[PDB]
Ligand binder design. Structure first.
Ligand SMILES: C[C@H]1O[C@H](O[C@H]2[C@H](O)[C@@H](O)[C@@H](O[C@H]3[C@H](O)[C@@H](O)[C@H](O)O[C@@H]3CO)O[C@@H]2CO)[C@H](O)[C@@H](O)[C@@H]1N[C@H]1C=C(CO)[C@@H](O)[C@H](O)[C@H]1O
Ligand SMILES: C[C@H]1O[C@H](O[C@H]2[C@H](O)[C@@H](O)[C@@H](O[C@H]3[C@H](O)[C@@H](O)[C@H](O)O[C@@H]3CO)O[C@@H]2CO)[C@H](O)[C@@H](O)[C@@H]1N[C@H]1C=C(CO)[C@@H](O)[C@H](O)[C@H]1O
Ligand code: NA
Length: 827
């Protein structure tokens, strides 16, 4: 006949029981053989009838007790089955098992009543979820977030999860710790956020070369616009990945384009690494500079000019950089670098920040519209609280600085939350003015002289003018060069200053390119304290009148001077095709200094309302504008397909490294067809395009996997979150995925790469001593290619452990290791 034996699983395989690599979860569901509402009648289940494992099986009697009470006190009481707040109140872990199981069974009869009554298992599912949050052990809090709600676990080897084992996982082998011989030092840590990819794994390192080759040939390989090919890379999280891959990328690029001897070929394939750590400069220098180093002078800029209060003194613009500009009168000596006033991450750090001020760390609903209104309202004020002061002055410094490839932020030229390029920012005129002036005037040596604690003169001596005493070698010498005068004190007394324009600019006239007034900036001298033109004396000294002002554009002083000319000039230096040093890839000099990068996106860029609004399409339409502005090198957003639930849908939350969008499923930026065209439009204007390559993480991978984990700090060593920790734990992490793109293109070009450039696969990597391995292709990511994950908000108590200490297990398809062990209550 019938009975409670019907609580067994219908069958002990995946078809009737949820599992992940054979293991069961307390959030899992299974198909009993039958259920009952009263005790007497038992209905054989259909394959559509599933119930939560937490109705039948518990981690401990304590939790079994709390499951019964919480359900009774949330509408599953029924006195006719001895279930009232009163009848369950006194139950405890020391209550008899035989008794507790009688109660849980009787609760199970009422649950079945609710299911029929409400015609679904939905309120039940919702109740289970809520119950789990009350149990510290099963809750997401058991994975031990740190004080700021962050943290990560590492994937370690384990006899239960041996399919996820790795011989590699060499963590924090970054920068100057590639060999693992200075773990304690200035190296930059392994973990940032998301599922961390193991870039020490020879197969992964081979997959990166594949990926890079796909992107350097994107349009050709995809049969889109065949000139729609990236020329180089912008390297995300370069301080946070085994530095082997920065070596390897540079090797591939030198193999493909012959960059080492040829400054022309190098400079046509610019690469730049994100990461200001001074140690990175050191590292890149020792290596012959395969990529540009990311300088910190933008932080100096914000601290000296951008703050409302607490403004670091003016002389920090001279020394507050990987390059000292006291008197920089030499070439090929500075660390080849890229610098900026702003990037995507600085805006975010401000916008988040406004988000927690306005709304007390609460339900993070989308009142990022409110944070943005506040930003835009503050951006226009003279007395700003949040936004940056002196934005034009900062770009004046950035754009006149020798030995750097400067980087403009889309967001500083355009209102980044409006549709792409639909709204210019109030700073567009100023910045673009200075950008054009750079092309025409900014070359030669540099001298930054202090004149007070608040006032500086940054002079460039002009093309082919090495220093203050030089005569002039080029025929643009006389009519090029610039003086940038910046005061960071808005109450600075009016006064007269002297500026040495060099011995090659005696009795020369100077245009007042840009000057400060009561209201802002004037481009023709109207409203300022200086005339449209001034002249130098015999020794090349310029008298200028300066004063403190306070308006939305300037808090202090900004003035800029350039030679009078009747013509357009362009002071770029072509790279000659024979490097002063054949050990170098990149060299800091006039040729490299003639480059300028544009960051073409913001995280808060909105979803396009239509195809006409795809950033890719609008870029293709405005390529000549970018060229006019003096931009040579385009940094394009990570173009990869994203996690559906990502906050900003921005490119950094990667589910498919090869799907750059299709016509019906574009990214925020557009389709791959449209990307390839956008790239080709830029090429058509003589620009180059670099892609943002994200080797560090993947996010929103839909496949769960039973892995074994240790709560670890961000370098990869275990850590204690205030007393507590845990190691060698079963965790049901999202680790597996990649999409058709990883399946279709994974490892596909390694044959071609090997035949064309064998050295890639015989050169031994520093961190491993072993060459990249092209003999396995990665067509799907999983835990075995991953160091770990940022805390996934799941919990560490989900894996069902039998009373005897062993994890519950099921022999299934992939699952074919040990013997099937199921709880007493489900078999
Ligand atoms: C991972 C997250 O941030 C990434 O940018 C990182 C830098 O790559 C990282 O080095 C770090 O900053 C500095 C580093 O601490 C230091 O050692 C070195 O001297 O200089 C580094 C350069 O700044 O922190 C920033 C972030 O603040 C990438 O931009 C993204 O991968 C990612 N950004 C976002 C995106 C998403 C998803 O769309 C979020 O999930 C993520 O939380 C968020 O930060
Ligand atoms: C519907 C409309 O919206 C489109 O914008 C898209 C993005 O291009 C796309 O990335 C997609 O992004 C992710 C989204 O944030 C996330 O919530 C979801 O779960 O996953 C998506 C991909 O991972 O969604 C945004 C919008 O949220 C384009 O701008 C439009 O072309 C697109 N077309 C629609 C609407 C119109 C407009 O009239 C029709 O003409 C068109 O036929 C229709 O397909
Ligand atoms: Na990493």
């Amino acid at each position: 006949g019938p009975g409670t034996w019907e609580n067994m699983a219908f069958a002990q395989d995946s078809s009737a029981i949820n599992n992940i690599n054979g293991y069961l979860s307390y959030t899992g569901w299974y198909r009993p053989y039958g259920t009952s509402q009263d005790g007497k009648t038992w209905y054989p289940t259909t394959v559509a009838d599933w119930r939560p494992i937490l109705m039948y099986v518990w981690p401990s009697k304590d939790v079994q007790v709390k499951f019964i009470q919480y359900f009774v006190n949330h509408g599953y009481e029924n006195s006719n089955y001895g279930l009232t707040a009163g009848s369950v109140k006194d139950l405890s872990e020391n209550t008899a098992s035989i008794n507790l199981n009688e109660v849980a069974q009787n609760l199970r009869y009422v649950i079945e009543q609710h299911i029929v009554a409400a015609k679904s298992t939905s309120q039940l599912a919702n109740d289970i979820n809520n119950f789990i949050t009350t149990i510290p052990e099963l809750s997401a809090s058991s994975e031990l977030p740190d004080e700021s709600g962050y943290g990560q676990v590492i994937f370690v080897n384990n006899d239960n999860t041996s399919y996820a084992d790795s011989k590699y996982r060499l963590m924090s082998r970054t920068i100057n710790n590639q060999t693992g011989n200075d773990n304690s030092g200035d190296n930059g840590y392994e973990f940032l956020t998301g599922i961390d990819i193991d870039n020490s794994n020879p197969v992964v390192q081979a997959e990166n070369l594949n990926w890079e080759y796909f992107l350097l040939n994107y349009g050709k390989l995809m049969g889109y616009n065949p000139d729609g090919n990236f020329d180089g890379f912008r390297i995300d999280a370069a301080d946070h990945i085994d530095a082997d891959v920065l070596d390897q990328m540079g090797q591939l690029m030198d193999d493909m384009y012959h960059m080492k001897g040829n400054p022309q070929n190098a400079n046509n394939h610019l690469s730049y690494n994100e990461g200001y750590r001074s140690s990175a400069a050191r590292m890149l220098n020792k290596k012959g500079n395969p990529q540009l180093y990311m300088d910190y002078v933008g932080s100096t800029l914000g601290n000296v000019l951008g703050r409302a209060n607490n403004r670091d003194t003016i002389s920090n613009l001279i020394t507050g950089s990987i390059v000292n500009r006291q008197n920089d009168v030499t070439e090929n000596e500075a660390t080849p670098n890229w610098s900026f006033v702003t990037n995507h991450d600085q805006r975010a750090n401000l916008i988040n920040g406004l988000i927690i001020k306005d709304h007390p760390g609460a339900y993070k609903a989308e009142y990022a519209n409110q944070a943005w209104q506040e930003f835009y309202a503050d951006q226009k004020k003279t007395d700003k609280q949040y936004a940056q002061y002196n934005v034009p002055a900062q770009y004046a410094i950035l754009l006149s600085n020798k030995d750097t490839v400067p980087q403009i932020y889309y967001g500083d030229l355009y209102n980044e939350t409006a549709q792409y390029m639909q709204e210019k920012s109030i700073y567009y005129d100023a910045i673009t003015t200075l950008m054009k002036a750079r092309k025409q005037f900014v070359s030669g040596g540099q001298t930054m002289t202090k004149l007070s604690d608040n006032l500086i003169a940054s002079v460039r001596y002009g093309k082919g003018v090495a220093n203050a005493n030089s005569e002039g070698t080029d025929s643009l010498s006389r009519t090029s060069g610039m003086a940038v005068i910046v005061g960071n004190n808005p109450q600075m007394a009016e006064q007269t200053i002297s500026i040495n324009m060099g011995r090659a600019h005696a009795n020369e006239q100077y245009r007042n390119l840009l000057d400060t007034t009561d209201n802002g900036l004037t481009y023709n001298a109207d409203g300022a304290e200086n005339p449209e033109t001034l002249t130098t004396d015999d020794n090349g000294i310029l008298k200028v009148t300066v004063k403190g002002y306070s308006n939305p554009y300037v808090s202090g002083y900004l003035g800029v001077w350039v030679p009078v000319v009747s013509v357009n000039q362009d002071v770029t230096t072509n790279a000659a095709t024979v490097s002063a040093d054949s050990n170098k890839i990149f060299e800091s000099n006039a040729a490299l200094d003639s480059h300028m990068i544009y960051q073409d996106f913001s995280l808060y860029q909105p979803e396009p309302i239509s195809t006409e609004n795809h950033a890719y399409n609008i870029i293709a339409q405005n390529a000549e504008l970018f060229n006019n502005l003096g931009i040579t090198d385009f940094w394009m957003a990570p173009p990869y397909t994203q996690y559906s639930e990502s906050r900003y849908n921005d490119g950094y939350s990667v589910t498919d490294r090869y799907n750059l969008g299709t016509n019906a499923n574009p990214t925020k930026y557009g389709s791959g067809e449209e990307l390839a065209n956008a790239i080709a439009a830029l090429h058509s204007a003589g620009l180059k395009a670099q892609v943002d390559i994200v080797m560090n993480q993947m996010i929103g991978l839909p496949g769960q996997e039973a892995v074994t984990v240790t709560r670890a700090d961000n370098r990869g060593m275990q850590t204690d979150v205030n007393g507590k920790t845990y190691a060698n734990q079963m965790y049901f992490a999202y680790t597996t995925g990649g999409g058709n793109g990883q399946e279709t293109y994974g490892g596909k070009y390694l044959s071609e790469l090997q035949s064309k450039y064998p050295d890639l696969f015989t050169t031994r990597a520093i961190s491993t001593g072993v060459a990249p391995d092209p003999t396995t292709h990665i067509t799907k990511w999983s835990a075995k290619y991953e160091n770990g994950t940022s805390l996934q908000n799941i919990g560490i108590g989900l894996a069902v452990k039998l009373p005897n200490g062993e994890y519950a297990y099921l022999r299934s398809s992939d699952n074919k290791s040990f013997n099937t062990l199921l709880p007493s209550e489900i078999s």
